[model samples]
Target chain A: SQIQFTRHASDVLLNLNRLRSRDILTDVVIVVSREQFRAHKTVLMACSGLFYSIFTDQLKRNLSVINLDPEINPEGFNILLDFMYTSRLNLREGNIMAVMATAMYLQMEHVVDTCRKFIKAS
Target chain B: SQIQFTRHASDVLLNLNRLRSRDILTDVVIVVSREQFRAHKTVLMACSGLFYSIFTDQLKRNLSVINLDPEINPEGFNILLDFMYTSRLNLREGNIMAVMATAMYLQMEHVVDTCRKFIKAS
Candidate 1:
């Protein structure tokens, strides 16, 4: 028989977030305007198809920094980055628009849909 | 208010496992005897305190390969590695001892406890 721990997935994500917090084991940086976000490529690739495609290139392992388009909102990118690691997106009325636009640019459909649902509800 | 997707954590892990299967964005390789397993350092460090400490050192990164001790069971190690990414452990009477030993060596108390519980119940 197989024993599955339901909390294990969250636990892994929690620790990975902790690692990111401490700047440990992070291989890539996502730069949005003046702000920079340190992260694991594996997590980014897992959560974003755009990132997956970016990292899938045979010539791109040592990529240290990725500069986002100038219009990409740093605030929204930060929220989505947090959501990637924590699975929690705390969207306020103020930040919802930027978050949705950033999610769309990142090719994260789930997050875009979540933002739309939030907009529709409120 | 915040929106939390209940399945997001598992979904991230599921996709991470897919990336592992394809050997995409893997930063490290673990060698167990003659067998080699490619994995993400972030995932390994998240799941094991020993790995966390090892990775916490100032002098490490670009650490492409980690060789296990000769006595370590490759089969058991493989199961634990799968658990680190999949959150599922299938332990039969035949493999329980090896799996438990591997968990202990890896300093994963939760997995060790799970193995103990499985053994006690059986």
Candidate 2:
């Protein structure tokens, strides 16, 4: 089995340097800003949609409850889309809060619930 | 061997809930707002100090090169301190850049180098 090491943002870069010294490919997106970090929020939204999209597609109907509107919250929606394609996200404060609210408004039960727990922990 | 899982802020909360269901204590702090996230930056500063303090104390002398004037960059120093204790931080763009500069000036060789890599990746 392949093992994955999840590390702090700073540590990851260090590890990357160490790995690169051995001539290994260190391909990763290390987010250092809140806005760039928001990209992760979008990815989460996409994941939520992908999960529902499967069910909706099976039923041959669209889920109206999911906010597919990109205009209202372009950043939020972009974060969602990114999550759908990638399982990883750069976590940030503002984007996470915004995504949490959007997830709740869209009635993404699990996402909303998860965000609530995060709020309490924070 | 113990296997630890590192997850995004949102996912970590979800996993915490799952772990809690099995009666596990999840005491991790999850910063969901920008202000709260700044706490992580403080931790980083503290960590940098701890590393240097260990060496400086051995020499029976304080390192004046490292900025001790809190008034000069209170926010920046706070973020550094936070990283030292927790090894985790919620980073925003401007502050990440700011801290990167501070880390460089403090002559925290590893931190400055790592921040530079992160900036490039972001």
Candidate 3:
């Protein structure tokens, strides 16, 4: 009999989403178009190195609202943000270049590297 | 140019071995009997708090030499070394105990966590 420990990269989304929904650990809100993205800044900054630099002394020191660049597609941002927490994305959902572009622009190196892997392997 | 950037986490070894060969970035050498494993302690430390803590101050004082844990299995360590740099591994290699224990010993949460994910997917 083999015993297995159950876990998945996508399990991160459970914790990340629960943190947002229960209003437990979320620390910042990012506004993209008509939507607001909620996340912990420390986690966000860790996932996005550029966000670390962007927030360290920038952002008027309020640490509240991060207004995204004008061109980010909210639909695309959702996939990358989901990947940022969970390391899983449905690259086959068919916005490959758009999702990859958001990853590239935000300097999410992990996502940038694997987005192409998803392309090459998918 | 739509402009795609190419990179991979697997590229760390290219520099890791490169640094070891050229004597550029390495600061510590780990000994397992007569087999020597060389790497930069900074990167090594990034992988394991438990392990690198055992070395950090002593390493700074002189050329550091570490003997790996007697419990470390070569098959497991090799798989972990690949995962350490690339965040990828093959679960079909099939000794679940080896990689998980090795990852725990090294304090690599990423490897330890992803190990479970691979188990599920496979």
Pick by DockQ: which candidate is best? Answer: 1
lDDT by residue (B1-122, candidate 1, tens digit) is: 56888898999999999989998878889999999999988889889877777777777656788888889999999999999999899789999999999999999999899888888999
- Candidate 2 DockQ, CA atoms: 0.02
* Model 3 regions more than 4 Å off: A1-16, A58-61, B1-122
User: Number of clashes in model 2?
Assistant: 27
Q: Pick the candidate with the highest lDDT.
A: 1
Residues A5-82, model 3: lDDT tens digits: 233222333444445565443557888788888875544554565675665554443467888987988878887676
Sort the candidates on lDDT, descending order: 1, 3, 2
Model 2, position A24: C-alpha lDDT score: 30
Expressed as tens digits, the lDDT of each residue in A1-122 for candidate 2 is 21122344334333322333432321222232233221122123223544334323535222223334343355654444333333333335677777665555444555556567667878
Q: Which prediction has the highest TM-score against the true structure?
A: 1
- DockQ-superior candidate, 2 or 3: 3
| Candidate 2: tens digits of C-alpha lDDT, residues B4-108 | 123333343333233334422211222322322221111222235443343335362322233343433546655554444334443566677767765664555
Q: Distance from true position, residue A18, model 1, in Å?
A: 0.6
Give per-residue lDDT, candidate 1, residue A107.
97
With candidate 2 superimposed using the best TM-score fit, by how many Å does residue A19's alpha carbon deviate from the native? 28
What is candidate 1's lDDT per residue for A11-67, written digit by digit as tens?
999998998999887889999999999998988988988888888887775698988
Once superposed on the true structure, which residue ranges of model 1 sit more than 4 Å away at CA?
A: none
Which candidate do you rate higher for TM-score, 2 or 3?
A: 3
